[PDB]
Amino acid sequence: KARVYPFEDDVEVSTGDRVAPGDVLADGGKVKSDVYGRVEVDLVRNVVRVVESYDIDARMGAEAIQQLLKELDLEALEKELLEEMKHPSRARRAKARKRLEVVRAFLDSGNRPEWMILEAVPVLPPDLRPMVQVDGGRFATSDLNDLYRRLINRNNRLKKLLAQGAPEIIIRNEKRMLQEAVDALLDNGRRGAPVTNPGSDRPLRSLTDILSGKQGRFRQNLLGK
Amino acid sequence: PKISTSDPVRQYLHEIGQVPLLTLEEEVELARKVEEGMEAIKKLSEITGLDPDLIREVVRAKILGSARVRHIPGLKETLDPKTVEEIDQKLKSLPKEHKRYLHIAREGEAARQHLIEANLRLVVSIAKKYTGRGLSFLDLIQEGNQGLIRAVEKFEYKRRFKFSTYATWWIRQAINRAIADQARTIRIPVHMVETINKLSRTARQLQQELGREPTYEEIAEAMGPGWDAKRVEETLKIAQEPVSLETPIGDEKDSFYGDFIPDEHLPSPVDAATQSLLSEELEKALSKLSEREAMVLKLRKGLIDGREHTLEEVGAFFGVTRERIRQIENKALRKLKYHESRTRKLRDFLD
Amino acid sequence: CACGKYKRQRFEGKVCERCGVEVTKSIVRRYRMGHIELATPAAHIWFVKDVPSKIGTLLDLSATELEQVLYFSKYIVLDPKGAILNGVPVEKRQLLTDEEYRELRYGKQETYP
Ligand SMILES: [Zn+2]
């Protein structure tokens, strides 16, 4: 589903551009386009194709969310939600007002919602997730390190693939794994736990478990000095 | 609502959707278009004078970039502003004879994308074999995927080899290399994964050859020429997991391995209190001394370095050097023995 | 320092020129943070899986919608213009499948043997 445009001499733009309607295309600007498309420029058969295509900015993953959260005008949402107080009665009040409890709490604190997204993952000081040498020239170490490793590895690889200008499908795949890797670090096992390949199918202790203890808690107990 | 929880692999195995039907004809054409592209980028930086890698960046930008022009390019490393337009407006404002190389270059980068996508299934089938070897299936796939990029970078179509079974190699390479690097917590050299894997190979024969688990001497003879009782042992030590601090102990619920490991770094109230007093009492000791003398020992030990001869060279910054400083140590140390034998302060610190 | 140029505490507070390591107490190792700069932002799971998803709540996205974009199975729009399949122009938000996206920003093609 394209639109062909023959040309005699000159040819502005090249194959892969986003154009139209009515954009300079070839021959001193004698050939214009008609509908929004994607340029193809046929080398041999003197014709440029415009393939029916818009320039949609639709995205996936946290990058997509972060944006929405950045552009979100809370001042204006607060007014807008107060404008749904018993307007469809018990229906959309009961619901879309627990929505306001959040908005307000953000406004009172001065915390950009965006911040819920991470673009820099912090790292716990090494001395308390140590790498001790024990008996027998063998080592003991926290699971965090192994959680942190695999995250670093996937980030670094993602950098390479992006630097390579790899196909967006193998990039998605990477981004998926990265998101998961971050999940696994912060609060492991809220999506089917990861384990140390050998040892056993014992799930790795995440930060969240290390903080509170996985045992529901913080009681139970495990509590005393 | 915990439905689509563990998709990952199933999810990614939707690239059946990207039509893998690659005829020889289509395979060759794409490969050809890649090559002619790579060459065009040379002709370009030859004509423009710009860096070839920098051009390829801009060609990639104009094909991929629409929502792929990264909003954070590594915090000001790659520049994604109007510098790309400026480059493209340069290339586009070339005469016909040269400008054709731009169009060749664009096609090429478009052809790369397809040629890679077409063979993603190939990676999966190869990576399917390397599982469990210490690295997640998805990790292996991605690792192998870059093997496939490189294979496309290297492949020459003029030699009519089947791209499939060519790339095969490069994919295998990147995977194996990944395992040697990433699989272990304490990173190890590759020729050391080699050997470790070679030992756990020979342990298999030597078990069933003998019946019993082989002695170390047994497994060394088998290993070859550089090998030794001590070496087999000292190796396997290195070969191990290692142990998780978060490993529970017997009672399971309350105790963990880590709980039992004691700090031997930081000095305990008794220790700390000592060496602090020592500092104070040594001062009180070498205070009543010649100021020049006191520094000698403080520069023979008292600051930082053993000073076998180094101090004896730069003779207390300025002063008579070597065999006459040897004499000062003697009298300074012996001057302390006068005092110490009488006022027993320092005696007790000798444990 | 790491390389070993500095000791004593005489040089208290100096970063080493060769090895790059500050000369302080070692205890500082149980208190000093690092970070990792992600190539792509990632969602903090607390603000997603703890219900009501504090972000979902903020965006009018149900947990299943959130999942879909956040874990890469549906695209969410930010700026559009497009209008096909239904014929209906889709607007600032709400999500679409691969084949929906690959029909809009990529076009309609078909090969035949
Ligand atoms: Zn140093």
From Swiss-Prot, chain A:
The superkingdom listed in its UniProt entry is: Bacteria
Please list which residues make up the signal peptide: none
Q: What does this gene product do?
A: DNA-dependent RNA polymerase catalyzes the transcription of DNA into RNA using the four ribonucleoside triphosphates as substrates.
UniProt subunit comment: The RNAP catalytic core consists of 2 alpha, 1 beta, 1 beta' and 1 omega subunit. When a sigma factor is associated with the core the holoenzyme is formed, which can initiate transcription.
- Similarity comment: Belongs to the RNA polymerase beta' chain family.
Protein name stated in the entry: DNA-directed RNA polymerase subunit beta'
Q: Which organism is it from?
A: Thermus thermophilus (strain ATCC 27634 / DSM 579 / HB8)
Q: What is the lineage of its organism?
A: Bacteria, Thermotogati, Deinococcota, Deinococci, Thermales
What fragment of the whole protein does this chain represent? 397 to 621 of 1524
Curated annotation (Swiss-Prot), chain B:
Q: What are the transmembrane regions?
A: none
Region (Sigma-70 factor domain-3) residue ranges read 194-272
**Sigma-70 factor domain-2, as annotated region:** 115-185
Where in this protein does the record put region Sigma-70 factor domain-1?
A: 6-41
**Residue ranges annotated as motif Interaction with polymerase core subunit RpoC:** 139-142
**What is this protein's function per UniProt?**
Sigma factors are initiation factors that promote the attachment of RNA polymerase to specific initiation sites and are then released. This sigma factor is the primary sigma factor during exponential growth.
For this UniProt record, give its keywords in alphabetical order, as a comma-separated list. Cytoplasm, DNA-binding, Sigma factor, Transcription, Transcription regulation
Enumerate the Gene Ontology biological process terms: DNA-templated transcription initiation
**Species name for this entry?**
Thermus thermophilus (strain ATCC BAA-163 / DSM 7039 / HB27)
**Family per UniProt?**
Belongs to the sigma-70 factor family. RpoD/SigA subfamily.
Question: Which parts of this chain does the entry mark as a DNA-binding region?
Answer: 311-330
Q: Lineage of the native species?
A: Bacteria, Thermotogati, Deinococcota, Deinococci, Thermales
Q: Where does the protein end up?
A: Cytoplasm
Give Gene Ontology CC terms.
Answer: cytoplasm
Which one of the record's GO molecular function terms can you name?
Answer: sigma factor activity
Q: What is this protein called?
A: RNA polymerase sigma factor SigA
Positions of region (Sigma-70 factor domain-4): 285-337
Q: How does it assemble?
A: Interacts transiently with the RNA polymerase catalytic core formed by RpoA, RpoB, RpoC and RpoZ (2 alpha, 1 beta, 1 beta' and 1 omega subunit) to form the RNA polymerase holoenzyme that can initiate transcription.
Q: What is known of its domains?
A: Contains 4 domains, connected by flexible linkers. In the active conformation, the domains are in an extended conformation, each making extensive interactions with the RNA polymerase catalytic core.
